[PDB]
């Protein structure tokens, strides 16, 4: 759910900020410690097929 | 004549005048993208069109509509250079206006509220440079133009191979730009069939029913009518007298009280003429002749209301009686002939499973989406959505054009969707082809071949983005609340941005520009490909499409194509070629009206050129330009022969127009076999630039055009005088006539200095002009890499001798004097980009610190306090460029190691050394360093030193700009003030800043002063904002990948000269690999005592027939001759008269050439410089097929003092004794391709290993071993060597135990192997056992 909210913020602030919000931008928009973005933003990614 | 031509003139042989001069060679690349991104106030291709296609997006019936207004492209975030340094893409933000309207519910249509969302941002679209290149990640890239089957209809054969009964078959294919394919095809039974895409075959008529045609209308469409009357009683018939052609009388043919034909007599032209002139409309026939006739329409009994006969049924003697008593006067039958008008459609109906529209639609819907229950709305929707929907189907303009044209229609433009008339007409043309009238087209013809380019493809990918955003918009407009959301919340960025990013980043047609070379660039940018999307595959299409077509003339170069797996699937664009208005290929021609050859140029496409008889590039006309012979070699349709004097409509523009820019650079090409010419033009692009750009001694005259058109050089924007010349920049003072009134001016050129090319070569510009020199507009200000004085030098010319030398030249091998490696001419400068990545590991972050566990003071010396290498420090293999350390704690050592630590009291660090070091064996100097930092992380010491440095250099540069500019402007104000109020000594006294107050008498000059005021201030503030922006760009943290804290990129410049194992080649397809580097002492020399640079092998010349390389040598020699003479006459310092005389003599050369010449040029200062440049050798031009002749070469050799033979006496530098026989010595232009051996060389003992299956793999760029394949194994099998093989596939590679147990024995001095079982087979055992299969190893 956290990841999803993080996506919402991106969707709104993307054209609003003109390029994309900085990696620390959605951080304050989100309630939690806000460096967590990076951490979360990493673990969210699905592993690439080794057969790619 | 121009100003750099006064510096150097190339002597040009050849006769034919150039009626047209070579255009911009980059035309295609720039024009395409020029069309893509642009504002076109109509449906012509561009972002506008692709917008107007999918838009406006309306919801499903909900009357919430999203309409597109207009768009714009924002200024680039980083400019080209900055984007190249940092590694981001050079692109513009796309800002598009969207208007969201909501219709009041239960309208007459009117809007509750329409919110216009101002320019929602979707994606960033890449930009093309002035050179036709894109920068994707810090790297220039080119998008190859595509060649595919043009949209439209097409008729083919497929005779032969199918069925082996012959009879051919005939098929039609409708290929749209977008949407499903529509196919028609016959069969051996002459039943017409239709298939959508490659899918299931259906009887043709089944589609017609879906267009709502009853059987009656199908028959009425495809056949004529044979009328039968029962009048009085018993069987008359209407007769069109032409109907009896190609047929024999079945009975007595008689009417009008006169018997025209009798039974058993074939009806000929005579009978038919007799019937025509006597005008027999109606004849009497037997009741038995209709036994085979096929009834046209339906027939029912008027009384009983029952069906007597269905449409398209074979009548019988009894059926006739049954419909006759019902009161039927007339019967309509098909007109059927097995020769002229064929009975195909009828039998097609005979195989048709359906009856009515709905039924056909059912079979179609169950064809396209089989197994799932068909529905009425489903079949209707699918079928209407296939070829008939504006959304899912377009042939576009080229498609509709070629379609209508091939159907022999009038309209050249029409709807993008098919019509009943369209499909029907296509079927008609196919049936006509089977009937014997009309011919089948061929796929290889360039009229059926269409060229796309960057713009079109980018348009298509963006189109896909727009459709995937359309689905989303309609998805959201479904449940939407009214005034809350706007055209932002729905439309995303990532889908579009990635739609374009995927295209430019990875695509088979998008590639890294091949820049090792100005020829390579420009020849890459002009290229065609039949591969990729919309095209065929190498595995699919065979020899035909690859093979050179007659239509390739003047459009596609016959001799330049790759030699590999894809041959002729690429080709290249011809010199004078152009993309047609519709997107075809057209080539220049000269119109011949009446008996004269007119100098008016004409462009003819592949089909346009077809019927006209075109004359030859090489032909003899004179005076008024009338053909000198009474018949001349020409080519009319697909072939060539002798044609009558006045027949020919046109003539070739130039002699070169058949070939490309690569082939046009080969001297004496006409004398080379096509294979070796191919190989030659193929290799000429692989030439690495030299340290000193030389010049070709033996030229063509194209090299100038390649040099200038390609962006490697620096060309004057406007003519003027040079104010300043630095190795850094060049400042030119503009002439007034070319100068704009405002902002005064001077044109400042910032030259590219040493930097990394795509191929890891060096790209560096050098100034070709001096302080205070006149420069014409469009003149070369600076030379790029491999360009000399405005020409293209891809390599260096040298003295070469053909003769076997001690077998050191053995196959193609090259034997080169030490004089060459000493002169450092063939030396090359490589620029490598190395990187160091600071990452985040769960054990901790990685430090770039200069504190590295286990390194001597010598190792940490070349690094500063921060851990990065100093700019300029020369390094070699093993040197540390960037110190990097990553945490790994608790080594977990063992007992003996613990004892060792106990004795030696060493603290084993918790840190591991990851530092980036120069790859083994390579060595060079550091020309630059960059530090990218995550935004917000503290910049270390080095990065801050660098940042401050860059800031200072920035301020200095900008200040220079503003200063030279301001002085340039005030210098103009000074001049304008002097008209109308001149004060000479008075004005320059008072401070310049106070000049603007002073006015002038009433005139326009006051308004000019005003202009310069305005622009002055503009520049003044523009400086400010530019400095601000530069500062922010320097200081800002560059965005980085996940986990990477900082990145340090070091730029090395390696200088490698030449060594045995390197590849070198002429322009003629003659390769070689340098064998030995031989002392000047042992070199063959002539009586004059001048050694020869290179010794080639004569045996290479006869077999591969390239005789040009010999001619090139001879003329080359002669060229140098003209140089040497001059070189003496200057060293004699004779005078202007003697030199002038000799040079003129040289430039004249017997009779009949087109060069012209001097003494319009200044007799002293200009001439002496010309000779000064000529003294190296006299540059000669040999136009492709117009080139020099033997007699001309010998004649120039006479002027040279050198023999006609081109051969002289040579002596072995070893024994000093003469060589028997004369040997050929001359000057051959030679290229160093980059195959260089210190790249190619690899060796491995024990390296890393692959995880999944344990096998040798390079992870360090420490190479994996060689691959031992099946054939090598067989070769080991033929020999009795078992152990070599076993160790080859067990211990040396695949055995995880075997390799180490081996290595230990190898160092122990015991050669053995304890093989074990290979890990491949071991894994395979599990893979087999992972299934329901039990695989075991038995016995003992
Ligand atoms: F530019 C030129 C110069 C000379 C000739 C020429 N002069 N005399 C005969 C030929 C000749 C005839 C046919 C072909 N190839 C096959 C093309 N046919 C037409 C329809 N498509 C398939 C078959 C060629 C060529 F160039 F391909 F080799 C040359 C033709 C063009």
UniProtKB/Swiss-Prot annotation, chain A:
<protein>
    <recommendedName>
        <fullName>RNA polymerase sigma factor RpoD</fullName>
    </recommendedName>
</protein>
<comment type="similarity">
    <text>Belongs to the sigma-70 factor family. RpoD/SigA subfamily.</text>
</comment>
<comment type="function">
    <text>Sigma factors are initiation factors that promote the attachment of RNA polymerase to specific initiation sites and are then released. This sigma factor is the primary sigma factor during exponential growth. Preferentially transcribes genes associated with fast growth, such as ribosomal operons, other protein-synthesis related genes, rRNA- and tRNA-encoding genes and prfB.</text>
</comment>
<comment type="subunit">
    <text>Interacts transiently with the RNA polymerase catalytic core formed by RpoA, RpoB, RpoC and RpoZ (2 alpha, 1 beta, 1 beta' and 1 omega subunit) to form the RNA polymerase holoenzyme that can initiate transcription. Identified in a complex containing RpoD, the RNA polymerase subunits RpoA, RpoB and RpoZ, CRP and DNA. Interacts with Rsd; this prevents interaction with the RNA polymerase catalytic core and with promoter DNA, and as a consequence, promotes transcription from promoters that require alternative sigma factors.</text>
</comment>
<comment type="subunit">
    <text>(Microbial infection) Interacts with Escherichia phage lambda antitermination protein Q.</text>
</comment>
<feature type="region of interest" description="Sigma-70 factor domain-3">
    <location>
        <begin position="1"/>
        <end position="52"/>
    </location>
</feature>
Curated annotation (Swiss-Prot), chain B:
<dbReference type="InterPro" id="IPR007641">
    <property type="entry name" value="RNA_pol_Rpb2_7"/>
</dbReference>
<comment type="subunit">
    <text>The RNAP catalytic core consists of 2 alpha, 1 beta, 1 beta' and 1 omega subunit. When a sigma factor is associated with the core the holoenzyme is formed, which can initiate transcription.</text>
</comment>
<dbReference type="InterPro" id="IPR015712">
    <property type="entry name" value="DNA-dir_RNA_pol_su2"/>
</dbReference>
<dbReference type="Pfam" id="PF10385">
    <property type="entry name" value="RNA_pol_Rpb2_45"/>
</dbReference>
<feature type="modified residue" description="N6-acetyllysine">
    <location>
        <position position="1198"/>
    </location>
</feature>
<comment type="function">
    <text>DNA-dependent RNA polymerase catalyzes the transcription of DNA into RNA using the four ribonucleoside triphosphates as substrates.</text>
</comment>
<dbReference type="InterPro" id="IPR037033">
    <property type="entry name" value="DNA-dir_RNAP_su2_hyb_sf"/>
</dbReference>
<dbReference type="Pfam" id="PF04560">
    <property type="entry name" value="RNA_pol_Rpb2_7"/>
</dbReference>
<dbReference type="InterPro" id="IPR007642">
    <property type="entry name" value="RNA_pol_Rpb2_2"/>
</dbReference>
<protein>
    <recommendedName>
        <fullName>DNA-directed RNA polymerase subunit beta</fullName>
        <ecNumber>2.7.7.6</ecNumber>
    </recommendedName>
</protein>
<dbReference type="InterPro" id="IPR019462">
    <property type="entry name" value="DNA-dir_RNA_pol_bsu_external_1"/>
</dbReference>
<dbReference type="Pfam" id="PF04563">
    <property type="entry name" value="RNA_pol_Rpb2_1"/>
</dbReference>
<dbReference type="GO" id="GO:0006351">
    <property type="term" value="P:DNA-templated transcription"/>
</dbReference>
<dbReference type="GO" id="GO:0003899">
    <property type="term" value="F:DNA-directed RNA polymerase activity"/>
</dbReference>
<dbReference type="InterPro" id="IPR014724">
    <property type="entry name" value="RNA_pol_RPB2_OB-fold"/>
</dbReference>
<keyword id="KW-0808">Transferase</keyword>
<dbReference type="GO" id="GO:0000428">
    <property type="term" value="C:DNA-directed RNA polymerase complex"/>
</dbReference>
<dbReference type="InterPro" id="IPR007645">
    <property type="entry name" value="RNA_pol_Rpb2_3"/>
</dbReference>
<dbReference type="Pfam" id="PF00562">
    <property type="entry name" value="RNA_pol_Rpb2_6"/>
</dbReference>
<keyword id="KW-0240">DNA-directed RNA polymerase</keyword>
<dbReference type="Pfam" id="PF04565">
    <property type="entry name" value="RNA_pol_Rpb2_3"/>
</dbReference>
<dbReference type="GO" id="GO:0032549">
    <property type="term" value="F:ribonucleoside binding"/>
</dbReference>
């Amino acid at each position: 759910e956290t990841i999803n909210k993080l996506n919402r913020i991106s969707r709104q602030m993307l054209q609003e900020m003109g390029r994309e919000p900085t990696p620390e931008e959605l951080a304050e928009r989100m309630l939690m410690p806000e460096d967590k973005i990076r951490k979360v933003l990493k673990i969210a990614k699905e592993p690439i097929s080794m057969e790619t | 004549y121009s100003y750099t031509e006064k510096k150097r003139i190339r002597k040009d042989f050849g006769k034919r005048p150039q009626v047209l001069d070579v255009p911009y060679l980059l035309s295609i690349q720039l024009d395409s993208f020029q069309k893509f991104i642009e504002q076109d106030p109509e449906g012509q291709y561009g972002l506008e069109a692709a917008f107007r296609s999918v838009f406006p997006i309306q919801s499903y019936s909900g009357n919430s509509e999203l309409q597109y207004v207009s768009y714009r492209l924002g200024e680039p975030v980083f400019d080209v250079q900055e984007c190249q340094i940092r590694g981001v893409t050079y692109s513009a933000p796309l800002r598009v206006k969207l208007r969201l309207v909501i219709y009041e519910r239960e309208a007459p249509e009117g809007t509750v509220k329409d919110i216009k969302e101002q320019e929602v941002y979707m994606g960033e679209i890449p930009l093309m440079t002035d050179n036709g290149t894109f920068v994707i990640n810090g790297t220039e890239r080119v998008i190859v133009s595509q060649l595919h089957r043009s949209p439209g209809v097409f008729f083919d054969s497929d005779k032969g191979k199918t069925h082996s009964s012959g009879k051919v078959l005939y098929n039609a294919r409708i290929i749209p730009y977008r949407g499903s394919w529509l196919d028609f095809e016959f069969d051996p039974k002459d039943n017409l069939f239709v298939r959508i895409d490659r899918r299931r075959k259906l009887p043709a008529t089944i589609i017609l029913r879906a267009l709502n045609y009853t059987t009656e209308q199908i028959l009425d469409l495809f056949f004529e009518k044979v009328i039968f009357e029962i009048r009085d009683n018993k069987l008359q018939m209407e007769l069109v007298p032409e109907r009896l052609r190609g047929e024999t009388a079945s009975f007595d043919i008689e009417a009008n009280g006169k018997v025209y034909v009798e039974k058993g007599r074939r009806i000929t032209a005579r009978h038919i003429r007799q019937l025509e002139k006597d005008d027999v409309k109606l004849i009497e026939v037997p009741v038995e002749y209709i036994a085979g006739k096929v009834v046209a329409k339906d027939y029912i009994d008027e009384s009983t209301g029952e069906l007597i006969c269905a449409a398209n049924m074979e009548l019988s003697l009894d059926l006739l009686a049954k419909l006759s008593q019902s009161g039927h006067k007339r019967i309509e039958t098909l007109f059927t002939n097995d020769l002229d008008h064929g009975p195909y459609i009828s039998e097609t109906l005979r195989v048709d499973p359906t009856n009515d529209r709905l039924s056909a639609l059912v079979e179609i819907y169950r064809m396209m989406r089989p197994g799932e229950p068909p529905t009425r709305e489903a079949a209707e929707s699918l079928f209407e959505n296939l070829f008939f929907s504006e959304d899912r189907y377009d042939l576009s303009a080229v498609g509709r054009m070629k379609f209508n044209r091939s159907l022999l229609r009038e309209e050249i433009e029409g709807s993008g969707i098919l019509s009943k008339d369209d499909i029907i007409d296509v079927m008609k043309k196919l049936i006509d082809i089977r009937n014997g009238k009309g011919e089948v087209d061929d796929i290889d013809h360039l009229g059926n071949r269409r060229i796309r380019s960057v713009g079109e493809m980018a348009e298509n990918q963006f189109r896909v983005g727009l459709v995937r955003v359309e689905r989303a918009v309609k998805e959201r407009l479904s449940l939407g609340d009214l005034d809350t959301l706007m055209p932002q919340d729905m439309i995303n960025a990532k889908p579009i941005s990635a739609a374009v990013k995927e295209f430019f980043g990875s695509s088979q047609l998008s590639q890294f520009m091949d820049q090792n070379n100005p020829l390579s660039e420009i020849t890459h940018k002009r290229r065609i490909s039949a591969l990729g999307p919309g095209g065929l595959t190498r595995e699919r299409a065979g020899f035909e499409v690859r093979d050179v077509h007659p239509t390739h003339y003047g459009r596609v170069c016959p001799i330049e194509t790759p030699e590999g797996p894809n041959i002729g699937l690429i080709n290249s664009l011809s010199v004078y070629a152009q993309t047609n208005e519709y997107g075809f290929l057209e080539t220049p021609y000269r119109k011949v009206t009446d008996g004269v050859v007119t100098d008016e140029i004409h462009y003819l496409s592949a089909i346009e050129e077809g019927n006209y008889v075109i004359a030859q590039a090489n032909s003899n006309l004179d005076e008024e330009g009338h053909f000198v012979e009474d018949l001349v070699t020409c080519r009319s349709k697909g072939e060539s022969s002798l044609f009558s004097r006045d027949q020919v409509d046109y003539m070739d523009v130039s002699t070169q127009q058949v070939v490309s820019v690569g082939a046009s650079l080969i001297p004496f090409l006409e004398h080379d076999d096509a294979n070796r010419a191919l190989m030659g033009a193929n290799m000429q692009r692989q030439a690495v630039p030299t340290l000193r750009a030389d010049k070709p001694l033996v030229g063509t005259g194209m090299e100038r055009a390649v040099a200038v058109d390609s962006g490697v050089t620096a060309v004057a924007k406007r003519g003027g005088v040079v104010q300043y010349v630095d190795a850094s920049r060049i400042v030119i003072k503009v002439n007034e006539d070319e100068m704009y009134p405002g902002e005064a001016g001077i044109d400042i050129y910032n030259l590219t200095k040493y930097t990394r090319s795509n191929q890891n070569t060096c790209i560096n510009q050098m100034p070709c002009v001096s302080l205070g020199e006149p420069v014409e507009r469009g003149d070369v200000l600076a030379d790029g890499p491999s360009t000399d004085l405005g020409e293209l030098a891809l390599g260096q010319n040298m003295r070469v001798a053909f003769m076997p030398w001690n077998g050191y030249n053995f196959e193609d091998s090259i034997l080169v004097s030490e004089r060459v490696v000493q002169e450092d001419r063939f030396t090359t400068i490589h620029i490598q980009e190395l990187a160091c990545v600071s990452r985040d590991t769960k054990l901790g972050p990685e430090e770039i610190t200069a504190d590295i566990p286990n390194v001597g003071e010598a190792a940490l010396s070349k690094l500063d306090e921060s851990g990065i290498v100093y700019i300029g420090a020369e390094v070699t293999g093993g040197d540390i460029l960037v110190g990097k350390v990553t945490p790994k704690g608790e080594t977990q050592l063992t007992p003996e190691e613990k004892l060792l630590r106990a004795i030696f009291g060493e603290k084993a660090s918790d840190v591991k050394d990851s530092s980036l070091r120069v790859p083994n064996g390579v060595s060079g100097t550091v020309i630059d360093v960059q530090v990218f930092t995550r935004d917000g992380v503290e910049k270390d010491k080095r990065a801050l030193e660098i940042e401050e440095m860059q800031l200072k250099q920035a301020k200095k540069d900008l200040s220079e700009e503003l200063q030279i500019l301001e002085a340039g402007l005030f210098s103009r104000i000074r001049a304008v003030l002097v008209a109308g109020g001149v004060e000479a000594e008075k004005l320059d006294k008072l401070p310049r800043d106070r000049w603007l107050e002073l006015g002038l008498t009433d005139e326009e000059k006051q308004n000019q002063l005003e202009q310069l005021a305005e622009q002055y201030d503009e520049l003044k503030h523009e400086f400010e904002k530019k400095l601000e922006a530069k500062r922010r760009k320097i200081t800002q943290g560059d965005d980085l990948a996940p986990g990477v804290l900082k990145i340090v990129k070091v730029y090395l410049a390696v200088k490698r000269r030449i060594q045995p194992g390197d590849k070198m080649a002429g322009r003629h397809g003659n390769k070689g690999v340098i064998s030995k580097i031989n002392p000047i002492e042992d070199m063959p020399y002539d009586e004059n005592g001048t050694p020869v640079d290179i010794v080639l092998n004569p045996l290479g010349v006869p077999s591969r027939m390239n005789i040009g390389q010999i001619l090139e040598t001879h003329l080359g020699m002669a060229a140098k001759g003209i140089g040497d003479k001059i070189n003496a006459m200057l060293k004699q310092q004779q005078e202007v008269a003697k030199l002038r005389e000799f040079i003129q003599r040289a430039y004249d050369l017997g009779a009949d050439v087109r060069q012209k010449v001097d003494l319009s040029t200044f007799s002293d200062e200009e001439v002496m410089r010309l000779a000064e440049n000529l003294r190296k050798g006299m540059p000669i031009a040999t136009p492709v097929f117009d080139g020099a002749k033997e007699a001309e070469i010998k004649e120039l050799l006479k002027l040279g003092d050198l023999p006609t033979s081109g051969q002289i006496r040579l002596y072995d530098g070893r024994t000093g004794e003469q060589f028997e026989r004369p040997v050929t010595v001359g000057y051959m232009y030679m290229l160093k391709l980059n195959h260089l051996v210190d790249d190619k060389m690899h060796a491995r003992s024990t390296g890393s290993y692959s995880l999944v299956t344990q096998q040798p793999l390079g992870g360090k760029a420490q190479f994996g071993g060689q691959r031992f394949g099946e054939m090598e194994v067989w070769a080991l099998e033929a020999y009795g060597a078992a152990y070599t093989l076993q160790e080859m596939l067990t211990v040396k590679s695949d055995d995880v135990n075997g390799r180490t147990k081996m290595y230990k024995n190898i160092v122990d001095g015991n050669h053995q192997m304890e093989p074990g079982m290979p890990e491949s087979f071991n894994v395979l055992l599990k893979e087999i056992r992972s299934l329901g299969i039990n695989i075991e190893l038995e016995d003992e």
